[PDB]
Point group: C11
Chain length 67, copies 11
């Protein structure tokens, strides 16, 4: 199953997981401080991922940056 790499470029970045299934809501928000990296898969419980805050992101489709 595929994954996303997120590197926080500032304190307070949120990596938020969205529920798989008929309904869509946030079930977890992981806080990243500056320089921390999270590598996060899609899973049985998480079919969409939202990033809030400034971070460097890598996926299979290349690099993108949130602000």
């Amino acid at each position: 199953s595929d994954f996303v790499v997120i590197k926080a470029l500032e304190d307070g970045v949120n990596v938020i997981g969205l529920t798989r299934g008929a309904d869509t809501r946030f079930h977890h928000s992981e806080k990243l401080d500056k320089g921390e990296v999270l590598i996060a898969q899609f899973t049985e419980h998480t079919s969409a991922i939202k990033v809030r805050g400034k971070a460097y992101i890598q996926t299979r489709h290349g690099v993108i940056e949130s602000e």
Copy 2:
């Protein structure tokens, strides 16, 4: 399953999931504020995704941009 990356280039962008199945309707709209990124899969419940508003989108077939 494939996924799409959507980065909102202005406030109020909507990423809209359309129902899988014989019926087609919107089941969810995720609102993105400028500079937020959403990475969203195709799923048992979502077989088409629509984006409204200004955004930079990546998929397996390359970059495309939506404009508001």
Copy 3:
């Protein structure tokens, strides 16, 4: 796990039309896009062909093609 098509409307009133899978072929849904909206649409248990009408920039795994209104 199926393939998908990206459609970006280059004018108002673009229609992305889904054709039914199976022995019966007909249109079952027509999605209206206005200028600059994007639809990323899979082939599905219900949709085995997709017709685009109106001016649009389309990406498939075979590359770019453009429809003209």
Copy 4:
């Protein structure tokens, strides 16, 4: 499962689906007007596709053009 892209270069381009199975005949003809695009899969019901008329065609093996 594979698909063919068909872009009509004139009115009345006919995309013809041939039946899968021991018998071969057409079971559907989808006409396209100039500039419309049809992205059609091979399926449980369609194992061969014929294009009549002027059309620009993409498949996994590259581009080909039909002449009407």
Copy 5:
């Protein structure tokens, strides 16, 4: 999910002949193409070999080849 061949007729009366899969081998269908028409034909449960007669431009996963009439 089988492979498919692309056949473009370069003259009228090209024949794309499907041969039967299985222990026995015979022609089960000849699809006749006129000049400029394109047939995209899979290998299937019933067709394990395809013969082209007449002048045609052909694409398969191993490249381009041309039949001559």
Copy 6:
């Protein structure tokens, strides 16, 4: 499943299927005259293919030529 493309470069080329299994024998010989093309799979019944006669051959390993008699 893999296939081979055979284009006859003279009359009377044979494309010969050998039986799959513990027994090996020819079960079919498809005659090609000049300019005809056969695109033939490996199958539940054919696990080896012999070409006799002058032909241009494509497989997934590239181009090979058989030389006639």
Copy 7:
């Protein structure tokens, strides 16, 4: 299943496994000292990994560096 390579560039780097499932929490934190390498899979129990401290990281998507 995919894996991530982490080389500690300073002492006390923490590679933290997050639980797979409805619940998300840290179930393990592996401490690396300077110059140690950990190569770590996604698994039945671990569906996200977090690195804290200065490290050089390789994944399928290329190289990235965490900072302390």
Copy 8:
């Protein structure tokens, strides 16, 4: 499933199929005259193939040439 192409560079090239299983011996020998081509798979009954005589051979790992 993999296959090899064998082109005979002289008369009487011998393509030898070795039996798959705990035992090894040849179960079939197909002779090729000069210029003939055999395209042969690995199968339930053949798990090694030997070529005797001058032949031009292609496999997934490139070209090799047997000499008589």
Copy 9:
């Protein structure tokens, strides 16, 4: 499964397997002397591998070096 190559660049390099499962602990420590090479899979019992000591390592993701 994926495997890692580890070449000891000094004596007493440790290639340590961490248990797969809810619990994470060392189950095995393989000591390599200078110049020895260990080629080691991920497996039913081993879902993370830690290298301590100076070594040259290859993974699908490319080269990395652990240092003493």
Copy 10:
């Protein structure tokens, strides 16, 4: 399943298949003379292959050459 290509570069080359399982021993030694090519798979019964004698070898990882005593 993977296979290795072995071309003998002198008489008397041996390609030795080692048994798959908890037990490791030689179950078969195929003797090759100069110029002959063996294309051998890994199988239910053979999980390692040893080559003794001068030979030119291809595998998915590239060319390697065995040298005889």
Copy 11:
């Protein structure tokens, strides 16, 4: 399933299988003299392979050389 190629560069090189399973111990040591080549899979019984002595090694990750 993958394999590794080992060419011995001097006499008495040892290619050592380590047991798959909860337990890790040797199980078999194949001695290669100079110039001999062994091509060995990962298997139900072997999940790690050690090379001791001077040898040229190829894996899917490239060339590496052990030193005695």
